[PDB]
Amino acid sequence: PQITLWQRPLVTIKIGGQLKEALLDTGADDTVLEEMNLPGRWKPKMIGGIGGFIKVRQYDQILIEICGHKAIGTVLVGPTPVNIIGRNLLTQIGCTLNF
Amino acid sequence: PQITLWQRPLVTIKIGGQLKEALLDTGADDTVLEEMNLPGRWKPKMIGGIGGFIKVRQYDQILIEICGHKAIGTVLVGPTPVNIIGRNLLTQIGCTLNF
Ligand SMILES: COC(=O)N[C@H](C(=O)NCCCC[C@@H](CO)N(CC(C)C)S(=O)(=O)c1ccc(N)cc1)C(c1ccccc1)c1ccccc1
C-alpha cells in the first residue's frame, strides 16, 4: 500500500496470535512494543528517546505480521507511548519513503 | 526520490539561513530541532515519547526546504537528541510510506 502522513500511520500487527495497533516509524531504529508476554530468553537493551534513555527487554527471532506482511526479527518490550514498528522490521516488509 | 530504510533516512534541510541534517520521521507528529534561533513569536510546549517529555519552543509558519522541497509549518526547538522532520512537514513535501 501507499500510506500518506496526514494522520498517524497506525496499522494492525499480529504477534503471539493477537492483533495490536502499531505505528510505522521511520525515525525508530528498532521495534518497541508495550508490555506483553513473548517466548524464549531476552537480553538487556538501552534505547534512546526524545525524553532520554530507557531499559527494554530484547527478544530475537520473533514472528510478527505487519499489515499482512510476515516478518521474523527482534522485538523490544518496554514502556513506550505506543507500539512502534522500527526500521529493523520496516526493511523486512520492503518499506521505503517516497516523494 | 525513493529513500531506503536500510539506514536512518537522513536528509539535508535549510532553515533560518542554516543547513542542517535531519531525520525523516513518520513516527513523529511534529518537527523538532536542536537548539537554534528562529524569527517571530513562540510559545512553550511539551512533547513526549520514549524516555518521557521535553520542553520545547513552538514557532509557527516557519519556512523550510527539505531535500529540495519548500514547505511551511510549525517547528519545535529544544533538547532533542536528533533533528527530526515530523508528519506536519512530511505531508507538505508529499512524503509517503510504500510497501
Ligand atoms: C504532543 O504530542 C506528542 O508528544 N506526540 C509524540 C510525538 O510525536 N513525539 C515525537 C517523539 C520523538 C521521535 C521518536 C520516533 O518517532 N523517537 C526517536 C527520535 C528521538 C529520533 S523516540 O520516541 O525517542 C524513539 C526512540 C527509540 C525508539 N526505538 C523508538 C522511538 C508521540 C510519539 C510518537 C512516536 C514515538 C514516541 C511518541 C506520542 C504518542 C502517544 C503518546 C505520547 C506521545
UniProtKB/TrEMBL annotation, chains A, B:
Localization in the cell: Host endosome, Host multivesicular body; Virion membrane
Transmembrane portions of the chain: none
Sequence ranges assigned to domain Peptidase A2 in this UniProt record: 20-89
Family to which this protein belongs: Belongs to the retroviral Pol polyprotein family.
Name this polypeptide is given: Pol polyprotein
Organism annotation: Human immunodeficiency virus type 1
Residues of the full protein shown: 7 to 105 of 347
